[PDB]
Design a protein around this motif. Structure first.
Motif, PDB file in Angstrom:
ATOM      1  N   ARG A 161     -13.776   0.123  -6.427  1.00 22.56           N
ATOM      2  CA  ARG A 161     -13.244  -0.164  -5.039  1.00 22.56           C
ATOM      3  C   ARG A 161     -14.294   0.140  -4.095  1.00 22.56           C
ATOM      4  NH1 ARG A 161     -12.721   2.078  -1.249  1.00 22.56           N
ATOM      5  NH2 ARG A 161     -10.687   3.185  -0.760  1.00 22.56           N
TER       6      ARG A 161
ATOM      7  N   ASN B 298      -4.793  11.179   2.693  1.00 20.07           N
ATOM      8  CA  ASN B 298      -6.017  11.016   3.314  1.00 20.07           C
ATOM      9  C   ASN B 298      -6.131  10.183   4.348  1.00 20.07           C
ATOM     10  OD1 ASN B 298      -7.722   8.712   1.120  1.00 20.07           O
ATOM     11  ND2 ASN B 298      -5.595   8.537   2.105  1.00 20.07           N
ATOM     12  N   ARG B 299      -5.331   9.943   5.283  1.00 24.66           N
ATOM     13  CA  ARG B 299      -5.381   9.241   6.589  1.00 24.66           C
ATOM     14  C   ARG B 299      -6.611   9.805   7.317  1.00 24.66           C
ATOM     15  NH1 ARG B 299      -1.748   5.018   7.790  1.00 24.66           N
ATOM     16  NH2 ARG B 299      -3.730   4.531   8.733  1.00 24.66           N
ATOM     17  N   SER B 300      -7.095   8.839   7.950  1.00 21.16           N
ATOM     18  CA  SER B 300      -8.168   9.433   8.973  1.00 21.16           C
ATOM     19  C   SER B 300      -7.597  10.465  10.034  1.00 21.16           C
ATOM     20  CB  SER B 300      -9.263   8.329   9.645  1.00 21.16           C
ATOM     21  OG  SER B 300     -10.075   7.696   8.351  1.00 21.16           O
TER      22      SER B 300
ATOM     23  N   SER C 216      -0.053   0.991   7.213  1.00 19.50           N
ATOM     24  CA  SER C 216      -1.236   1.666   6.664  1.00 19.50           C
ATOM     25  C   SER C 216      -1.943   0.286   6.013  1.00 19.50           C
ATOM     26  CB  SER C 216      -1.102   2.408   5.555  1.00 19.50           C
ATOM     27  OG  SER C 216      -0.255   1.923   4.441  1.00 19.50           O
ATOM     28  N   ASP C 217      -3.333   0.453   6.037  1.00 24.73           N
ATOM     29  CA  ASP C 217      -4.268  -0.593   5.294  1.00 24.73           C
ATOM     30  C   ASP C 217      -3.876  -1.962   5.931  1.00 24.73           C
ATOM     31  OD1 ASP C 217      -4.229   1.711   3.673  1.00 24.73           O
ATOM     32  OD2 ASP C 217      -5.827   0.738   2.767  1.00 24.73           O
TER      33      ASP C 217
ATOM     34  N   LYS D  63      -8.583   4.793  12.379  1.00 26.30           N
ATOM     35  CA  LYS D  63      -8.582   4.057  11.192  1.00 26.30           C
ATOM     36  C   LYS D  63      -9.545   3.388  10.498  1.00 26.30           C
ATOM     37  CE  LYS D  63      -3.393   3.696  12.763  1.00 26.30           C
ATOM     38  NZ  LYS D  63      -2.428   2.976  12.987  1.00 26.30           N
ATOM     39  N   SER D  64      -9.302   2.927   9.324  1.00 28.35           N
ATOM     40  CA  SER D  64     -10.267   2.026   8.651  1.00 28.35           C
ATOM     41  C   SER D  64      -9.948   0.800   8.956  1.00 28.35           C
ATOM     42  CB  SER D  64     -10.308   2.538   7.148  1.00 28.35           C
ATOM     43  OG  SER D  64     -10.659   3.680   6.852  1.00 28.35           O
TER      44      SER D  64
ATOM     45  N   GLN E 112     -12.836  -2.899   2.867  1.00 32.70           N
ATOM     46  CA  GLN E 112     -12.212  -2.128   3.856  1.00 32.70           C
ATOM     47  C   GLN E 112     -13.559  -1.515   4.510  1.00 32.70           C
ATOM     48  OE1 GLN E 112     -10.017   1.324   3.171  1.00 32.70           O
ATOM     49  NE2 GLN E 112     -11.738   2.499   1.911  1.00 32.70           N
TER      50      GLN E 112
ATOM     51  N   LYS F  60       0.199   8.746   1.863  1.00 31.05           N
ATOM     52  CA  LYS F  60      -1.263   8.501   2.020  1.00 31.05           C
ATOM     53  C   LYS F  60      -1.565   9.847   2.553  1.00 31.05           C
ATOM     54  CE  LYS F  60      -2.056   4.975   1.390  1.00 31.05           C
ATOM     55  NZ  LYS F  60      -2.054   4.618   0.020  1.00 31.05           N
TER      56      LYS F  60
ATOM     57  N   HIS G  32      -9.251  -3.000  -1.341  1.00 27.44           N
ATOM     58  CA  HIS G  32     -10.151  -1.578  -0.752  1.00 27.44           C
ATOM     59  C   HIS G  32     -11.439  -1.905  -0.696  1.00 27.44           C
ATOM     60  CE1 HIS G  32      -6.103   0.717  -1.576  1.00 27.44           C
ATOM     61  NE2 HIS G  32      -6.530   1.218  -0.509  1.00 27.44           N
TER      62      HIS G  32
ATOM     63  N   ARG H 252     -10.751  15.018   3.693  1.00 29.17           N
ATOM     64  CA  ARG H 252      -9.913  14.040   4.022  1.00 29.17           C
ATOM     65  C   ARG H 252      -8.711  14.376   3.830  1.00 29.17           C
ATOM     66  NH1 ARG H 252     -11.806   8.658   5.327  1.00 29.17           N
ATOM     67  NH2 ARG H 252      -9.606   8.017   5.242  1.00 29.17           N
TER      68      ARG H 252
ATOM     69  N   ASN I 290       0.854  -1.152  -0.247  1.00 27.63           N
ATOM     70  CA  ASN I 290       0.161   0.014   0.060  1.00 27.63           C
ATOM     71  C   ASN I 290       0.694   1.296  -0.186  1.00 27.63           C
ATOM     72  OD1 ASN I 290      -2.837   1.701   0.503  1.00 27.63           O
ATOM     73  ND2 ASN I 290      -1.159   2.228   1.954  1.00 27.63           N
TER      74      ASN I 290
HETATM   75  O1  LIG Z   1      -6.503   6.472   7.579  1.00 27.10           O
HETATM   76  P1  LIG Z   1      -7.465   5.077   7.185  1.00 27.10           P
HETATM   77  O2  LIG Z   1      -9.008   5.685   7.544  1.00 27.10           O
HETATM   78  O3  LIG Z   1      -7.161   3.888   7.598  1.00 27.10           O
HETATM   79  O4  LIG Z   1      -7.428   4.714   5.500  1.00 27.10           O
HETATM   80  C1  LIG Z   1      -7.289   5.916   4.805  1.00 27.10           C
HETATM   81  C2  LIG Z   1      -6.956   4.616   3.582  1.00 27.10           C
HETATM   82  O5  LIG Z   1      -7.693   4.457   2.735  1.00 27.10           O
HETATM   83  C3  LIG Z   1      -7.203   4.588   1.317  1.00 27.10           C
HETATM   84  O6  LIG Z   1      -7.610   5.650   0.683  1.00 27.10           O
HETATM   85  C4  LIG Z   1      -5.546   4.630   1.551  1.00 27.10           C
HETATM   86  O7  LIG Z   1      -4.894   3.348   1.501  1.00 27.10           O
HETATM   87  C5  LIG Z   1      -5.406   4.930   2.933  1.00 27.10           C
HETATM   88  O8  LIG Z   1      -4.302   4.650   3.852  1.00 27.10           O
END
Ligand SMILES: O=P(O)(O)OC[C@H]1O[C@@H](O)[C@H](O)[C@@H]1O
Ligand SMILES: O=P(O)(O)OC[C@H]1O[C@@H](O)[C@H](O)[C@@H]1O
Ligand SMILES: O=P(O)(O)OC[C@H]1O[C@@H](O)[C@H](O)[C@@H]1O
Ligand SMILES: O=P(O)(O)OC[C@H]1O[C@@H](O)[C@H](O)[C@@H]1O
Lengths: 263, 262, 263, 262
Positions: free
Chosen positions: C153, C47-49, C231-232, C195-196, C187, C45, C184, D104, C10
């Motif tokens: 996805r 767009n992490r939560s 991640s993931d 986190k997802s 997920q 990454k 994905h 996000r 990832n």
């Molecule tokens: O931070 P979380 O919510 O785990 O997930 C964001 C993830 O979902 C996908 O867009 C990417 O792989 C990124 O790491």
């Protein structure tokens, strides 16, 4: 027009429970004279998730208990039917025959209720779109129903969750009087595994939304001690809070009423 | 062995049932690896419109279905809508079908289980895959021994259904799983006074069903879907049935090697 | 046509991780000659939560690590961009520029990728309907893209959950080559709070569904030890299982291919 | 005090911004109980079609917005789409708006927070109410002190959005909540090459928003929505703005007595 408030314990746990709740509703009907109260309680929970959950004490017992409420408090009555044959006997005591959400499309059940001459309130199925209820009303009219209600009780939103699309209120108002079910709208179907869950903290806020948007009445299940309810314990409102909630929606309704759109 | 439930949506006439039954019999003889069960509803008790076709009654329907079983020696399955219908229908129905909207009606389920027949429950569009565990439990309590759960789509916004294929393995934990290839592509009340559907997706999704893994498929078929008095938008032309079945048997043969256990 | 398999870790946790995963992908590309492998890994990454989650080691480091994979294993490369200015530098090493799901509607980002001359793969937003991607392709063509891919996805289904509507495969195939993102799609967005989450047990079954329906390739993220991924971690496939999964989808694809509808 | 964010969706011209700004100023003087913030996008960076209207550029947009603030003394809010735009926009924007699809994007959020301005994040259609806790956290980490979260609908099937009013109290736990009455009724990509919407539901839903409880409302308005170069299906006629505001103030006054704490 006169605002309708349908309230009572979810299930007829006992004739004593009904009289206890009925006494409070009678007291409220005396204060809130501008409101038309209708006592509600199911003689049977025919759709529990688990075979081990409380269902009820039968049709005969239930009707007898409901008749006792009408007789002792002069309150109108409403209860739901599950199969066609139950319509006739239930019509003896019920002023409004309620059609369960999952059964809102069963033609024979709707027809059975319609020919009794009693008013009919259909819970909008979680699978129905607001505009899909038009055909529901058509069936009822075809069957002889002259007083029809459609109740908003949430729509399937992902798994074990419901959302209320308030656009449904003005839409359904095109063909019937609309009722907002404040307690089932916050339940989480099958949320507890063998039973559905619910989020009580959202009951009041969403009911305020319903009256601000505009509806013809609200449906609220209440119990003296929700935590001990044999069904829907997560969504039943404490009986002590009923008065406050009712006063609030009448106030909001009054201030908002001049802005209600003409359908 | 692999189960294939097929037939016309509604019993428009026993004539229609015999024509379709004849083809299903021919396929039955051609695919010994498959167990065919003839399906057709004696009544459409949940039509959107009061003016739509419902059927000719339980007696006419049971009689016609009995003709099919006697003339072609095919097992039968039809759905019931109220508790009292279980008993008379059990006379001819090898499998009693429980409608999706009625999958939570305890008395209907128990009534079906009581007949001793097999029970196939259409998973409600409002149900989560894991919610079906409780459905199976009611049936076992009622004495049912052969229980099936049918995937037929889930409510996805208004007038649309989506098939969450994760449901197949999840439901397999407690019952044999059937994939309804016909109703999964229907668009509830999409045509105003009737439900719609997109036939172009029937085959692709049924291929996915066997690749994922299921114990059987449910497909409604009509000689001229266009003329069908019900579910005309989703019923499969009788002529195309053979090709699709051969196709899913082939895919199943190869993919079955990877079906996860339990 | 040649089936495309986009795989890799990832995120570019380290150049060493990339080479480790790349060695296996190189080995698989030698066996599965009928497959066109493309190594994938994000240099960021964006767009992490949570603000506390792993993002990466920067664009410069990432590109350098990816170039090392292409150089050492002769593998094609793909990575995602997050803002317009990143397109040019990423195009130096990336054969396919990937557009993030949440950004599938940002015109400038799509245009930046398109003018590089590299192929472009757009992750279909969780808020998009299959037919809404037509305009996405139109923008890319307008921008100069000659090789376009659309990746399935998952779609928003209630809260913290996604569902895969496989009808999207034949629909999107009307205007572009379609890729199925097997990792994905399972997920659970924000499922773990900060986190997802994800459900690995469904990765393989759904990938079988995708190839049975018919697609032009699959996207699978893999890691030597998923549990330790920065991640993931919930959706990354153990590297040891890659070979088996690939062999399976080629077999299912072969047996199903004759039934693929012509779009 | 109650916040009312209003203005034309896109900066079609500073002429348009002045006409709308004039009315918003008049209302500003008429409702001292309300804090008005003028809104208009210098660029529509997420149009469905490459051939749709986007705008006249950041420089033209910032200049026009500055005119509005100087001529009417109104606070300003506009959205940014890439990190580098935060700084120049912060020159005029009292509140920096973060687009729903971009809620996000960490770098965008941090860039906005860095300017020291207030930040209002449009809740993504893919986000759950509780998922916004993390959004606010990023902004605080970035140095933001005045943070807002805006409800603008959630993905509900295809080309449709639903407003889950439970989100207002939930999001109130960590930020001030704003209800976007305009985009909540839009139908994403509903018109093929553009998004649709149902204006008839704007008012009813906004009444629900104040009955439930929120810190402010966001409403896009145009003198002739029909002619709008963007979001024409949802923008409210300028003439109807006053009536709606007076209405929500009245409802809020009565209902506020019941707003639950925390
Ligand atoms: O931070 P979380 O919510 O785990 O997930 C964001 C993830 O979902 C996908 O867009 C990417 O792989 C990124 O790491
Ligand atoms: O058995 P669970 O899932 O709790 O809920 C079924 C309930 O939901 C409503 O239809 C009725 O009130 C019934 O009791
Ligand atoms: O909306 P319509 O087309 O009237 O009925 C819905 C159909 O979906 C299924 O339950 C039955 O086969 C029924 O005929
Ligand atoms: O689909 P279209 O109408 O092109 O764009 C969607 C609209 O929704 C909002 O993000 C913006 O205001 C944008 O203009």
């Amino acid at each position: 027009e006169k605002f309708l408030v349908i309230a009572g314990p979810n299930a007829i746990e006992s004739e004593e429970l009904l009289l206890k709740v009925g006494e409070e509703i009678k007291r409220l009907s005396e204060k809130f004279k501008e409101v038309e109260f209708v006592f509600k309680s199911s003689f049977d929970k025919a759709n529990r998730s688990s075979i081990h959950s409380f269902r009820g004490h039968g049709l005969e017992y239930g009707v007898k208990a409901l008749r006792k409420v009408k007789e002792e408090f002069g309150l109108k009555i409403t209860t739901d039917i599950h199969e066609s044959w139950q319509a006739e006997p239930v019509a003896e005591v019920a002023d409004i025959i309620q059609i369960p959400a999952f059964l809102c499309r069963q033609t024979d059940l709707l027809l059975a209720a319609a020919k009794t001459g009693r008013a009919v309130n259909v819970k909008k199925g979680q699978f129905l779109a607001p505009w899909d209820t038009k055909n529901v009303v058509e069936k009822l009219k075809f069957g002889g129903a002259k007083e029809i209600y459609l109740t908003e009780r949430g729509t399937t939103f992902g798994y074990n969750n419901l959302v209320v699309d308030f656009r449904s209120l003005p839409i359904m108002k095109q063909w019937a009087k609309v009722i907002y079910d404040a307690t089932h709208s916050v339940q989480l179907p099958g949320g507890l595994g063998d039973k559905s869950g619910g989020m009580r903290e959202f009951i009041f806020p969403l009911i305020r939304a319903a009256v601000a948007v505009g509806c013809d009445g609200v449906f609220m299940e209440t119990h003296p001690e929700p935590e001990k309810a044999l069904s829907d314990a997560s969504t039943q409102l404490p009986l002590s809070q009923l008065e406050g909630i009712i006063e609030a929606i009448l106030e909001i309704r009054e201030v908002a009423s001049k802005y209600y759109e003409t359908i």
